Amino acid sequence: QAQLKESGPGLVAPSQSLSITCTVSGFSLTNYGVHWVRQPPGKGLEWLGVIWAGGSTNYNSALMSRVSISKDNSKSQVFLKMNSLQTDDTVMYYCAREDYDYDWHFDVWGAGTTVTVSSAKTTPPSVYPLAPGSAAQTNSMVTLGCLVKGYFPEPVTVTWNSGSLSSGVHTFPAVLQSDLYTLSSSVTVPSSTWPSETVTCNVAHPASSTKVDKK
Amino acid sequence: NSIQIGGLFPRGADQEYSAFRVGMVQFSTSEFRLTPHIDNLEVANSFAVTNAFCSQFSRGVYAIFGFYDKKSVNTITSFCGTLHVSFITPSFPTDGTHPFVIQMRPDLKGALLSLIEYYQWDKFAYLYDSDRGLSTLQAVLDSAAEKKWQVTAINVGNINNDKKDETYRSLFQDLELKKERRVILDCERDKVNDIVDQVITIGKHVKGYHYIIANLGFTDGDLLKIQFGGANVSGFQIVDYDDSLVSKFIERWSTLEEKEYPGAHTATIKYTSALTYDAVQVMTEAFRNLRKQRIEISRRGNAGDCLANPAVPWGQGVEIERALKQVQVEGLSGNIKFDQNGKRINYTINIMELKTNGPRKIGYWSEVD
Amino acid sequence: LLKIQFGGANVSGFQIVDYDDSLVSKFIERWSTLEEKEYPGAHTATIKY
Amino acid sequence: ANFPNNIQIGGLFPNQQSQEHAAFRFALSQLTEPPKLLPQIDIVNISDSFEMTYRFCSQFSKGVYAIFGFYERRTVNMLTSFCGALHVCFITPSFPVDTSNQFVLQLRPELQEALISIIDHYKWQTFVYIYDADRGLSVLQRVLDTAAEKNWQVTAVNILTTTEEGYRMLFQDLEKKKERLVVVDCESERLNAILGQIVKLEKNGIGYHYILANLGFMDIDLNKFKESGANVTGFQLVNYTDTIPARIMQQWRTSDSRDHTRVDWKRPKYTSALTYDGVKVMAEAFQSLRRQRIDISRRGNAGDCLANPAVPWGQGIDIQRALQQVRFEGLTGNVQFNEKGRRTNYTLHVIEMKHDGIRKIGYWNEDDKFVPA
Amino acid sequence: EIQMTQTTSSLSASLGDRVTISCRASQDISNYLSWYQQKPDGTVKLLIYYTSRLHSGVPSRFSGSGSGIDYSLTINNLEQEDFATYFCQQGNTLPLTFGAGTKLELKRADAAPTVSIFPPSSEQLTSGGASVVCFLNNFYPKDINVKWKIDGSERQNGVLNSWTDQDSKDSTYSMSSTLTLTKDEYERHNSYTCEATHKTSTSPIVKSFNR
Ligand SMILES: *[C@@H]1O[C@H](CO)[C@@H](O[C@@H]2O[C@H](CO)[C@@H](O)[C@H](O)[C@H]2NC(C)=O)[C@H](O)[C@H]1NC(C)=O
Ligand SMILES: *[C@@H]1O[C@H](CO)[C@@H](O[C@@H]2O[C@H](CO)[C@@H](O)[C@H](O)[C@H]2NC(C)=O)[C@H](O)[C@H]1NC(C)=O
Ligand SMILES: *[C@@H]1O[C@H](CO)[C@@H](O[C@@H]2O[C@H](CO)[C@@H](O)[C@H](O)[C@H]2NC(C)=O)[C@H](O)[C@H]1NC(C)=O
Ligand SMILES: *[C@@H]1O[C@H](CO)[C@@H](O)[C@H](O)[C@H]1NC(C)=O
Ligand SMILES: *[C@@H]1O[C@H](CO)[C@@H](O)[C@H](O)[C@H]1NC(C)=O
Ligand SMILES: *[C@@H]1O[C@H](CO)[C@@H](O)[C@H](O)[C@H]1NC(C)=O
Known about the structure:
The structure is cut from a larger assembly and holds one copy of chain A, two copies of chain B, one copy of chain D and one copy of chain E.
Chain A: E1 3-7, E2 11-12, E3 18-25, E4 34-39, E5 46-51, E6 57-59, E7 67-72, E8 77-82, E9 91-100, E10 104-109, E11 113-117, E12 126-130, E13 141-151, E14 157-160, E15 170-171, E16 175-177, E17 180-190, E18 201-205, E19 210-214
Parallel strand pairs in A: 2-11
Antiparallel strand pairs in A: 1-3, 3-8, 4-5, 4-9, 5-6, 7-8, 9-10, 9-11, 12-13, 13-17, 14-18, 15-17, 16-17, 18-19
Chain B: E1 2-9, H1 14-26, E2 33-40, H2 46-58, E3 63-66, H3 73-82, E4 86-89, E5 101-103, H4 109-119, E6 123-128, H5 135-147, E7 150-155, H6 166-174, E8 182-186, H7 191-202, E9 210-213, E10 232-237, H8 244-253, H9 271-292, H10 316-324, E11 329-331, E12 334-338, E13 344-345, E14 349-354, E15 359-365
Parallel strand pairs in B: 1-2, 1-3, 3-4, 4-5, 6-7, 6-8, 8-9, 9-10
Antiparallel strand pairs in B: 10-14, 11-12, 12-13, 14-15
Chain D: E1 6-13, H1 19-29, E2 36-43, H2 49-62, E3 66-68, H3 78-86, E4 90-92, E5 104-106, H4 112-122, E6 126-131, H5 139-150, E7 153-158, H6 164-174, E8 180-185, H7 188-198, E9 208-212, E10 233-236, H8 243-255, H9 270-291, H10 316-324, E11 327-330, E12 333-336, E13 348-353, E14 358-364, E15 370-372
Helix pairs in contact in D: 1-9, 4-5, 9-10
The structure holds a molecule of 2 linked components (NAG-NAG) (3 copies) and 2-acetamido-2-deoxy-beta-D-glucopyranose (3 copies).
One 2-acetamido-2-deoxy-beta-D-glucopyranose binds next to loops of chain D.
Protein name (chain B): Glutamate receptor 2
Organism (chain B): Rattus norvegicus (Rat)
Extracellular side (chain B): 1-369
């Protein structure tokens, strides 16, 4: 089948460059065109630009002087360069192939990578526990939580005992406050397993590569 | 800039539409974008032709691409000459100077007369098909009246597919009354294979005979069955596979998926598909010349009914034909340049002959030489 | 034989099953009407030797 | 109310004032029995398919049931397709084509087989077939097939693409041998100019044999052939003195002396006789529809000509079977259609002209092919 | 330029229902629109091309129709793999504007939100902050409201709400509310309460905690 995946830096400074590498597979990029399109959170997905199979390239009318496209047909990859990034550039980016089936159609697209354009500094997160407080066994399943506060940038990987505990795991998404990431993870274990069994949450922050274990 | 065009492809044309898709993907540009409205209707039924034409005119298009049969050439020429809408076509050339009809297939009659005058014939048979008009037949009869030839001209298209085994036997028995050694076959890509199969079945491809496949796609039929026979076979080719651009197109053509593109996983290509792939380039170059000349012909989808009385033309289409005559490019049929009428000028046709190892070019043909 | 019938080369051969016999014709009349899914290679007008 | 008295009949005509207009109006004037055929005629160019298509769609939207008209090489197949689509019968005196359908009623009989019979009667080997560019495509096909069968030498000569110096060169090629056998197949309005070109060149006339493939051999202006060696043989359809045709003759002579008519007479045309006989076909067909008590309803509230998909007017097969089964003896002799809509079961006479000798050789038919007299 | 829009933002359907998704445009697009599906993981696959045809590889349960400016996609029977977001993309005039897209949802019983309040930890209180948490799990539908009260006084500053997607097991929802204040602000109050308002009950379920 045809697949595609976009990759980038994740976090970049303002008014800097942004190179996105899109790897596609299952087809050949020498006989089809490529299109790059962004997606903002809570807004409409806007097309950024396109490059033809022959060598012609065009962009959108709003930021034509900021976007550029190149391709590597040997590795079937696309390099999209975007400069003069502003504070509203915390969005996702995706690449796709084009085709003609009596209409200009985008056949195979990509997963898209997220980019947050901010001048904030990278720091390790802080893991805090969250128990129910009272030990009253109201049911056979007891829930615990871990709050990762003060992380930069998003996201981190929060697991329970290196992926051993997976029953009732409810990981919530992170939020931003004062340029700090706040996330909460929730697990549902049995009432007799705790505190007889050690439940340790492992948080891996790839921005600072910080691995924090909290029993 | 969004340019809307119309399309009339016949029911069964898979390789032509596949090459049309390859041309649409390959020849995209930044200045504009084509948007074809494709209609898969019959080509012989002129009622469906009129319906597809008025449906393409109701969308308000600037040009119409598509084929036309010999029973529908007059309908296309009249409907495109009245409404002054250009029509690009890889079908057979017309007889006359019809405006707004730009054609992709070159002439064949002059090259065939040059080939007969090169081979120095005096008595031969001309087995033809009546699905592309009777222009070549009138040309070879008017030349036989001047050069004192013995032409035995027989049509073959009036024979049904249910009893085409004894009729062909009686035909080649009647062709042995004058002891005919020289036969010119003027048929399309389907009847040539059937006539060659019946010749092989009755056994008339040994050395001593001579055949000419009178078409532009000489290698489109099956040649492996009349290669080891001994009867040399000449013909005409428009797509030279020794060119660099043709080789680069075949290297991207044969690797295509058959499920994604029907009739594409072959080492060769039909001539109609190559003329379609060139016509996409011609239309793209003409619209790019309009984008470079700063001429605004923009309108909307409110062209009205096709049967208006009086059907008033819109004058900015008159430039569009004058656009298309300005195109001089290089495609799979070689050089592409046009006259004031709409015919093709300054082209090249290879004269192929079939040897033991395969086909071989013995020379080229033009109109100034 | 339909491919070397209209050629012109005169071809001889040997046959063991004469189709003009009464018993052979009565067998072919019950042979060609057989179901191809029930009996493979049976729905033909002739038969191998 | 089984059948309305006014049946709309659409018409297509190339000119404004000609003999076929007066013949058509006189043929509609004899209608006294119900229903009355109301004409709706259109003077249109018969070479532009856009105008032909527009007049066809306008007459179809106005609510006609049968269209009587003409066509040309540029409209041989478009009117076959629009009639095979909407199931609307079209009656025409024009040139018969090879491939057609059951809805195109071709009033003019076939001509190529009688030509084959005359050439087999004279047993020719080498001759020159001059063909019209507008109609000589179906007759030339059968003539070249018969030439391939019987080992003839046909030299086919076009009219339109050959200039007058081309005519000079081809007759210069013809004047190098003993016998000069020429068949000419073109319409009489073109044949007058062609023979006007020829009679300045056939001043000797010795060894010149001509066959003019036309149903109007008496309509050909033979006054240029006075004191000429032209040994011309032609075909005849209408005997103007035969009892029922001369009765029709006397009827339109009596109509040409009481009130008024259109454009004048004394030089007839076979196309006008075909017009009269086709209107008589349509009259007998609507009378057969009346006496079979088969109603013809309508839904013509400005009916669309072009739609997607096609809506077949389902009543057309009854009109088609009524028009197919017409059988009488009119001005062109026997009138009778086959299962395809062409003329059969008729008779064509053969008349040779030489030195003011109007001689009848014999006649031609389909079952007893050719007989002399 | 040409702007595409969709009125329905969230649709509810069950397994086996013929679901219709509509789309509108700013002008006539001449049926040159495509419908594509995007799952929650991020993979985007095309579903219907040229507003009436189905591409090779998609199931026959989906279909498309429409004319002028109004197009629609119709699924005959929804499956487990059909839980995704459908988006319309028009390619008439460059720059091509894609639609906003709708989110299909599985219909189930309207369950009450299980609410749980959690006070701040001792290490967080030693750090100088206090983040009171309110978790509302196993709720249906996703429409719910949260209200914070500090000794009866409603406070809107410092409240952050984070919702989760529909689970693939129980077809429920989860929400987390965080009230972040200082240590002196948390010590100045005794009782903090979180109230959840859902469609299952007219009275909001309140969970309070004292000091
Ligand atoms: C190819 O077909 C033609 C036609 O039958 C033949 O060409 C003849 O070739 C010989 C040998 O060079 C010449 O002397 C003759 O002048 C050719 N023309 C004729 C007979 O018309 C021949 O049979 C075939 N082979 C070749 C090599 O030409
Ligand atoms: C009927 O329409 C036809 C089609 O246009 C006319 O024939 C053309 O007339 C032009 C006049 O300049 C010639 O150049 C063309 O050669 C003609 N033939 C074609 C296009 O095939 C014809 O003149 C019209 N007749 C009337 C009476 O209007
Ligand atoms: C074929 O031609 C004849 C010519 O004599 C037509 O005339 C009919 O002939 C038969 C018997 O000779 C008569 O009974 C009829 O009354 C004649 N007229 C008609 C209108 O049928 C006739 O068209 C054809 N004859 C047959 C038998 O089909
Ligand atoms: C034909 O095209 C070639 C290729 O550009 C050109 O060199 C030549 O001059 C042209 N000849 C004519 C007569 O136009
Ligand atoms: C007319 O032609 C015929 C047939 O060739 C011939 O027999 C006859 O003698 C010719 N007429 C005259 C007057 O010579
Ligand atoms: C044709 O009319 C003439 C004149 O009356 C007549 O003598 C002749 O017999 C008629 N021929 C036929 C076949 O009716």
